[PDB]
Design a binder for this molecule. Structure first.
Ligand SMILES: O=c1[nH]c(-c2ccc(C(F)(F)F)cc2)nc2c(O)cccc12
Ligand SMILES: [Zn+2]
Lengths: 162, 47
Protein backbone atom coordinates (compact mmCIF):
# COMPACT_ATOMS: atom_id res chain seq x y z
CA UNK A 1 0.00 0.00 0.00
CA UNK A 2 2.74 2.42 -0.99
CA UNK A 3 1.83 5.51 -2.97
CA UNK A 4 4.30 7.92 -4.53
CA UNK A 5 3.27 11.59 -4.79
CA UNK A 6 5.25 13.93 -7.08
CA UNK A 7 6.60 17.12 -5.63
CA UNK A 8 6.43 20.16 -7.89
CA UNK A 9 9.80 21.82 -8.57
CA UNK A 10 8.12 25.10 -7.50
CA UNK A 11 7.48 23.56 -4.07
CA UNK A 12 9.88 24.46 -1.25
CA UNK A 13 9.96 20.82 -0.15
CA UNK A 14 11.32 19.75 -3.59
CA UNK A 15 13.86 22.56 -3.46
CA UNK A 16 15.01 21.60 0.02
CA UNK A 17 15.62 18.00 -0.98
CA UNK A 18 17.38 19.02 -4.20
CA UNK A 19 19.74 21.33 -2.21
CA UNK A 20 20.49 18.52 0.24
CA UNK A 21 21.40 16.29 -2.74
CA UNK A 22 23.51 18.94 -4.51
CA UNK A 23 25.27 20.46 -1.48
CA UNK A 24 26.53 17.05 -0.20
CA UNK A 25 28.33 15.83 -3.31
CA UNK A 26 32.08 15.41 -2.70
CA UNK A 27 35.11 13.84 -4.33
CA UNK A 28 35.82 10.20 -3.54
CA UNK A 29 39.15 8.50 -3.08
CA UNK A 30 38.43 6.04 -5.95
CA UNK A 31 38.52 8.98 -8.42
CA UNK A 32 34.93 8.12 -9.40
CA UNK A 33 35.42 4.39 -10.03
CA UNK A 34 32.35 3.19 -8.13
CA UNK A 35 29.87 6.05 -8.58
CA UNK A 36 31.13 7.96 -11.63
CA UNK A 37 32.74 11.34 -12.23
CA UNK A 38 30.53 14.32 -11.38
CA UNK A 39 30.22 17.49 -9.27
CA UNK A 40 26.42 17.73 -9.45
CA UNK A 41 23.19 16.02 -10.48
CA UNK A 42 20.36 16.60 -12.88
CA UNK A 43 17.35 16.05 -10.61
CA UNK A 44 14.51 14.68 -12.75
CA UNK A 45 11.89 13.93 -10.09
CA UNK A 46 11.33 13.81 -6.33
CA UNK A 47 8.45 11.78 -4.93
CA UNK A 48 7.07 11.48 -1.39
CA UNK A 49 6.75 7.82 -0.34
CA UNK A 50 3.55 7.16 1.65
CA UNK A 51 2.82 3.92 3.38
CA UNK A 52 0.63 3.90 6.47
CA UNK A 53 1.73 0.51 7.77
CA UNK A 54 5.47 1.05 7.19
CA UNK A 55 5.13 4.47 8.84
CA UNK A 56 3.49 2.93 11.94
CA UNK A 57 6.21 0.26 12.10
CA UNK A 58 8.72 3.12 12.08
CA UNK A 59 7.05 5.28 14.79
CA UNK A 60 6.53 2.22 17.00
CA UNK A 61 10.26 1.46 16.89
CA UNK A 62 11.16 5.14 17.31
CA UNK A 63 9.14 5.35 20.54
CA UNK A 64 10.93 2.28 21.98
CA UNK A 65 14.35 3.67 21.03
CA UNK A 66 13.43 7.15 22.24
CA UNK A 67 12.34 5.83 25.68
CA UNK A 68 15.44 3.63 25.97
CA UNK A 69 17.55 6.75 25.19
CA UNK A 70 15.95 8.97 27.82
CA UNK A 71 13.50 10.62 25.58
CA UNK A 72 15.71 11.25 22.54
CA UNK A 73 15.13 9.51 19.19
CA UNK A 74 18.19 11.17 17.66
CA UNK A 75 16.36 11.26 14.32
CA UNK A 76 18.19 12.28 11.11
CA UNK A 77 17.50 12.56 7.39
CA UNK A 78 20.08 10.50 5.48
CA UNK A 79 20.67 9.12 1.98
CA UNK A 80 20.48 5.48 0.95
CA UNK A 81 21.59 4.00 -2.36
CA UNK A 82 20.74 0.39 -3.14
CA UNK A 83 19.99 -2.15 -5.89
CA UNK A 84 16.86 -2.93 -3.79
CA UNK A 85 15.37 0.60 -3.78
CA UNK A 86 12.26 -0.68 -5.58
CA UNK A 87 11.72 -3.40 -2.98
CA UNK A 88 12.46 -1.04 -0.08
CA UNK A 89 9.70 1.46 -0.91
CA UNK A 90 7.02 -1.31 -0.98
CA UNK A 91 8.14 -3.59 1.82
CA UNK A 92 10.35 -1.43 4.07
CA UNK A 93 13.91 -2.08 5.17
CA UNK A 94 14.93 -5.47 6.57
CA UNK A 95 17.85 -7.93 6.65
CA UNK A 96 17.65 -8.50 2.85
CA UNK A 97 18.91 -4.88 2.47
CA UNK A 98 21.98 -5.06 4.74
CA UNK A 99 25.57 -4.60 3.65
CA UNK A 100 26.99 -7.83 5.01
CA UNK A 101 30.60 -6.76 4.49
CA UNK A 102 30.27 -3.20 5.78
CA UNK A 103 33.02 -1.39 7.74
CA UNK A 104 30.92 -1.49 10.96
CA UNK A 105 29.34 -4.91 10.61
CA UNK A 106 26.29 -6.33 8.89
CA UNK A 107 23.60 -3.68 9.01
CA UNK A 108 21.87 -1.10 6.87
CA UNK A 109 24.13 1.81 5.90
CA UNK A 110 23.23 5.50 5.37
CA UNK A 111 25.23 8.56 4.27
CA UNK A 112 25.20 12.29 4.87
CA UNK A 113 27.00 12.58 1.51
CA UNK A 114 24.56 12.00 -1.38
CA UNK A 115 27.57 10.96 -3.54
CA UNK A 116 28.57 8.19 -1.08
CA UNK A 117 25.10 6.58 -1.45
CA UNK A 118 25.30 7.02 -5.26
CA UNK A 119 28.27 4.56 -5.18
CA UNK A 120 25.72 1.78 -4.31
CA UNK A 121 22.96 2.50 -6.81
CA UNK A 122 24.30 -0.28 -9.05
CA UNK A 123 25.55 -2.50 -6.26
CA UNK A 124 28.50 -2.82 -3.94
CA UNK A 125 31.45 -0.89 -5.43
CA UNK A 126 29.05 0.22 -8.16
CA UNK A 127 28.78 -3.37 -9.42
CA UNK A 128 29.10 -3.38 -13.20
CA UNK A 129 27.40 0.01 -13.68
CA UNK A 130 24.13 0.68 -15.49
CA UNK A 131 22.26 -2.24 -17.03
CA UNK A 132 22.18 -0.75 -20.53
CA UNK A 133 25.78 0.39 -20.96
CA UNK A 134 27.71 -1.38 -18.14
CA UNK A 135 29.00 2.05 -17.19
CA UNK A 136 29.46 3.04 -13.53
CA UNK A 137 29.85 6.60 -14.76
CA UNK A 138 26.82 6.52 -17.17
CA UNK A 139 25.48 10.03 -17.75
CA UNK A 140 22.43 8.80 -19.70
CA UNK A 141 20.67 6.25 -17.51
CA UNK A 142 18.32 7.40 -14.73
CA UNK A 143 19.35 6.56 -11.15
CA UNK A 144 17.28 6.56 -7.97
CA UNK A 145 18.27 7.36 -4.32
CA UNK A 146 16.25 7.38 -1.13
CA UNK A 147 16.31 10.19 1.37
CA UNK A 148 15.20 8.61 4.61
CA UNK A 149 14.14 9.34 8.16
CA UNK A 150 16.54 7.37 10.42
CA UNK A 151 16.27 6.74 14.22
CA UNK A 152 19.83 6.60 15.58
CA UNK A 153 19.08 6.49 19.32
CA UNK A 154 22.24 6.10 21.34
CA UNK A 155 24.87 5.97 18.58
CA UNK A 156 28.29 4.35 19.11
CA UNK A 157 30.96 6.64 17.74
CA UNK A 158 33.50 4.81 15.62
CA UNK A 159 36.36 6.80 14.14
CA UNK A 160 37.41 5.31 10.89
CA UNK A 161 40.43 5.60 8.67
CA UNK A 162 38.15 6.42 5.68
CA UNK B 1 22.12 -9.18 10.49
CA UNK B 2 24.57 -8.11 13.26
CA UNK B 3 23.54 -6.58 16.58
CA UNK B 4 23.96 -2.98 17.67
CA UNK B 5 26.71 -2.42 20.27
CA UNK B 6 25.52 -3.13 23.86
CA UNK B 7 23.29 -0.30 25.11
CA UNK B 8 23.49 1.44 21.68
CA UNK B 9 21.02 1.58 18.74
CA UNK B 10 23.37 2.47 15.87
CA UNK B 11 26.93 3.18 14.86
CA UNK B 12 28.24 6.49 13.62
CA UNK B 13 31.24 6.11 11.31
CA UNK B 14 33.16 9.35 11.36
CA UNK B 15 35.93 9.70 8.83
CA UNK B 16 39.13 10.74 10.63
CA UNK B 17 41.45 11.00 7.59
CA UNK B 18 39.46 12.93 4.95
CA UNK B 19 38.16 16.21 6.42
CA UNK B 20 35.54 16.81 3.75
CA UNK B 21 33.94 13.41 4.09
CA UNK B 22 30.71 13.44 6.10
CA UNK B 23 29.55 10.65 8.43
CA UNK B 24 28.05 7.27 7.61
CA UNK B 25 25.57 5.50 9.90
CA UNK B 26 24.57 1.92 10.48
CA UNK B 27 21.37 0.59 12.00
CA UNK B 28 20.69 -3.08 12.75
CA UNK B 29 16.89 -3.07 12.71
CA UNK B 30 15.07 -2.11 9.48
CA UNK B 31 12.24 -0.60 11.55
CA UNK B 32 14.59 2.28 12.47
CA UNK B 33 14.40 3.75 8.94
CA UNK B 34 11.56 5.08 6.80
CA UNK B 35 12.18 5.85 3.09
CA UNK B 36 10.48 9.23 2.91
CA UNK B 37 11.59 10.49 -0.53
CA UNK B 38 12.45 8.78 -3.85
CA UNK B 39 14.78 10.85 -6.04
CA UNK B 40 15.33 10.13 -9.75
CA UNK B 41 18.38 11.80 -11.22
CA UNK B 42 21.32 11.65 -13.62
CA UNK B 43 24.92 12.42 -12.62
CA UNK B 44 26.25 15.29 -14.81
CA UNK B 45 29.49 15.27 -16.84
CA UNK B 46 31.77 18.09 -15.56
CA UNK B 47 32.71 20.85 -18.05
O1 LIG C 1 23.65 4.22 1.04
C1 LIG C 1 24.44 3.30 1.28
N1 LIG C 1 24.13 2.05 0.78
C2 LIG C 1 25.01 0.95 0.99
C3 LIG C 1 24.65 -0.33 0.49
C4 LIG C 1 25.56 -1.39 0.51
C5 LIG C 1 25.19 -2.65 0.04
C6 LIG C 1 23.90 -2.93 -0.44
C7 LIG C 1 23.52 -4.24 -0.92
F1 LIG C 1 24.34 -5.21 -0.47
F2 LIG C 1 22.29 -4.53 -0.51
F3 LIG C 1 23.52 -4.32 -2.32
C8 LIG C 1 22.98 -1.87 -0.43
C9 LIG C 1 23.34 -0.61 0.03
N2 LIG C 1 26.16 1.14 1.69
C10 LIG C 1 26.50 2.35 2.17
C11 LIG C 1 27.70 2.52 2.89
O2 LIG C 1 28.50 1.45 3.02
C12 LIG C 1 28.07 3.75 3.43
C13 LIG C 1 27.21 4.83 3.26
C14 LIG C 1 26.02 4.69 2.54
C15 LIG C 1 25.65 3.46 2.00
ZN1 LIG D 1 23.68 3.70 -19.01
Amino acid sequence: GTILIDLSPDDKEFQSVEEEMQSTVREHRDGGHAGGIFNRYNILKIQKVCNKKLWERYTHRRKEVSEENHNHANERMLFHGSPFVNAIIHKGFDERHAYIGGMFGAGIYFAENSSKSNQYVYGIGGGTGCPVHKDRSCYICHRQLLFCRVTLGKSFLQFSAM
Amino acid sequence: MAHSPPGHHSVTGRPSVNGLALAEYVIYRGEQAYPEYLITYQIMRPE
